[PDB]
Design a protein around this ligand. Structure first.
Ligand SMILES: O=C(O)c1ccc(/C=N/N=C2c3ccccc3-c3ccccc32)cc1
Length: 329
């Protein structure tokens, strides 16, 4: 018989009604800028798929970021480019300023606006209750926008949320794992970072959607209000589901599995055990209590659910009482 199909409960048909050119990234013709406009200053980091540099646009003396892509998985490149251009101008979305061909790597190099970022490790130790709510709302603006545009990020994690704390500014970055949502489409479950992988990924359910980002967001929220980084600390993808099950319980996991007619990897049989759902108060202590409120716990509870269809959508999340105290623009 196989697994039961699933559909996003919102923005389901956005791509089906757009021109083919919008989501057919393979046919996208990249318009190239002049690589000589930019001078590399220092290397900021090297990821699995790229190297990131601080640079300067010598045509306006403005600081920029240059992301030089590695010559691996070429399809991945046009996908990120198309998604960046599609989302450009949206609230709290990183702005792609240019695309040039790097003369040395002989690969595409993405030029982004410069954002004076604070290290998340140092920053999460600092955030007040108000600031957690403020920045969560800003992240939600970004996620609702890309979801409404038919795109799931699929790599929401602290590293991909760049915050300029001095100016109260936030950008969602690295859309290299982002995809267009097409209802009924089966996707690769090898996305996101381990600690932020939704249950759908960990049980190998391929027909997922925007709600994946909302699980990841929930993981971030839990790490912020409970001051535990990361909140679900698996030592591999299998232990990762066990960690989640020790909090949300095994019965709701099996119900989830049963609902979508999924068959768990049999290796879970000797390690999953039997666990009751824990009350969120379990994780409150003297050092995080000032960050926890009934509102915060209700919100978290509605994000961290096994069933991806039952999680709050981005727009619903923005309606939650948790954000009543946040001053709106
Ligand atoms: O992949 C992307 O979309 C992407 C977009 C923008 C940036 C910019 N990053 N900036 C900084 C950075 C990156 C890695 C490690 C350290 C830093 C840093 C330190 C101070 C000021 C800015 C940055 C990256 C990727």
């Amino acid at each position: 018989s196989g697994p039961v199909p699933s559909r996003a409960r919102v923005y389901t048909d956005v791509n089906t009604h757009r021109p083919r050119e919008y989501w057919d990234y393979e046919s996208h013709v990249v318009e190239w800028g002049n690589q000589d406009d930019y001078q590399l200053v220092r290397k900021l980091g090297r990821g699995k798929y790229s190297e990131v540099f601080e640079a300067i646009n010598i045509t306006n003396n403005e600081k920029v970021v240059v992301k030089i892509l590695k010559p691996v998985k070429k399809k991945k490149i046009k996908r990120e480019i198309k998604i960046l251009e599609n989302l450009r101008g949206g609230p709290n979305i990183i702005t792609l300023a240019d695309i040039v061909k790097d003369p040395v790597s002989r690969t595409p190099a993405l030029v982004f606006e410069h954002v004076n970022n604070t290290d998340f490790k140092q920053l999460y130790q600092t955030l007040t209750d108000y600031d957690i709510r403020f920045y969560m709302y800003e992240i939600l603006k970004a996620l609702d926008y890309c979801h409404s545009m038919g795109i799931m990020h699929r790599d929401v994690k602290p590293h991909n949320v760049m915050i300029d704390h001095e100016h109260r500014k936030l950008r969602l970055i690295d859309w290299g794992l982002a995809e267009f949502y097409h209802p009924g489409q089966e996707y690769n479950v090898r996305v996101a970072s381990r600690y932020f992988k939704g249950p759908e990924l960990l049980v190998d359910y391929q027909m997922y959607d925007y709600s994946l980002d909302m699980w990841s967001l929930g993981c971030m929220l839990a790490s912020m209000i409970f001051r535990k980084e990361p909140f679900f600390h698996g030592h591999d993808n299998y232990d990762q589901l066990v960690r989640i099950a020790k909090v949300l319980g095994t019965e709701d996991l099996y119900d989830y599995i049963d609902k979508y007619n999924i068959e768990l990897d049999p290796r879970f049989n000797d390690i999953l055990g039997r666990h009751s759902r824990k009350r969120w108060e379990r994780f409150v202590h003297s050092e995080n209590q000032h960050l926890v409120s009934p509102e915060a716990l209700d919100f978290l509870d509605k994000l961290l659910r096994y069933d991806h269809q039952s999680r709050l959508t981005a727009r619903e999340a923005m309606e939650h009482p948790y954000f009543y105290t946040v001053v709106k623009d």
